[PDB]
Amino acid sequence: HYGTAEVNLQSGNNFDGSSLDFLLPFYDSEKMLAFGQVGARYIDSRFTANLGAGQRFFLPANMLGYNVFIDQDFSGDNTRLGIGGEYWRDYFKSSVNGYFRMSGWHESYNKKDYDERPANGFDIRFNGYLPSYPALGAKLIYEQYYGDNVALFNSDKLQSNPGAATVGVNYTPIPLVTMGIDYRHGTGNENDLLYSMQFRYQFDKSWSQQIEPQYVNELRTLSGSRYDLVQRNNNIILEYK
Ligand SMILES: CCCCCC/C=C\CCCCCCCC(=O)OC[C@@H](O)CO
Ligand SMILES: CCCCCC/C=C\CCCCCCCC(=O)OC[C@@H](O)CO
Ligand SMILES: CCCCCC/C=C\CCCCCCCC(=O)OC[C@@H](O)CO
Ligand SMILES: CCCCCC/C=C\CCCCCCCC(=O)OC[C@H](O)CO
Secondary structure (H helix, E strand, O other), X not given: OOOEEEEEEEEOOOOOEEEEEEEEEEEEOOOEEEEEEEEEEEEOOEEEEEXXXXXXXXXXXXXXXXXXXXXXXXXXXXXXXXXXXXXXXXXXXXXXXXXXXXXXXXXXXXOOOOEXXXXXXXXXXXEEEOOOOOOEEEEEEXXXXXXXXXXXXXXXXXXXXXXXXXXXXXXXXXXXXXXXXXXXXXXXXXEEEEEEEEEEEEOOOOOHHHHOHXXXXXXXXXXXXXXXOOOOOOOOOEXXX
């Protein structure tokens, strides 16, 4: 069996919490992978679950992929459609994600005297790894959301059509674990930091393979990276009214 289970722990401000996500192949060939993705998370005092599917198509030197998602913030009863695109290479992953709401305004879960609903937006994600030393990765994100009063950073400081850029580094001593730090900056001079740790289990790998720095290189190759989780924000950014 092939696929991935990933636990994520993150802190350090507004989106503190944890999550579990699975990538489950249902068709698997050298040239094309079709997969379901499913998971849930408790982050920023909300319980959210996510369900998706996509295809990945491979050439020896690159990969094209698309995916579709439904995101359900159960705490606040907010629903959203997600679409994604992927272009991956050795030591390089690029992704673009659209975020489209499916649920209307209604009494807000966390903010008194407000209504809330998902804010539409997109983001572009880059992840790159040093080929000579692939345990070192960096992380570029640009994200943009729309609405008169959106909470991209927190709900106590609402913002008009906020955008933000994130730079982060991360370290993967053995395939099983990644640690990193993300700095983000936007709109109103808003800043933050996210410290996070991922535990990665690979269904196709023996145990010893997953605790040996030898194999980090290969997780970061294109054929390495075939069962990695889709790269998106699985948290629904909300807007208020
Ligand atoms: C290139 C070097 C990379 C630098 C890495 C920096 C080193 C370590 C970062 C690890 C951060 C761990 C975060 C803890 C998880 C957490 O607290 O969340 C759980 C949640 O329930 C609490 O809210
Ligand atoms: C849950 C989100 C909403 C669901 C919407 C689903 C939308 C898109 C998912 C992608 C569907 C991929 C289809 C698989 C094609 C395939 O395997 O062919 C096998 C064949 O080649 C064997 O010879
Ligand atoms: C197989 C290759 C993958 C290519 C397929 C494409 C995959 C994903 C594309 C999704 C990107 C959507 C970005 C649009 C977001 C947007 O404009 O926000 C609405 C704004 O107007 C509000 O006013
Ligand atoms: C939008 C609605 C969200 C849909 C509900 C989300 C609920 C729970 C998330 C975890 C689910 C567990 C999935 C099963 C894990 C699994 O099958 O992987 C085993 C693997 O076979 C071991 O090899």
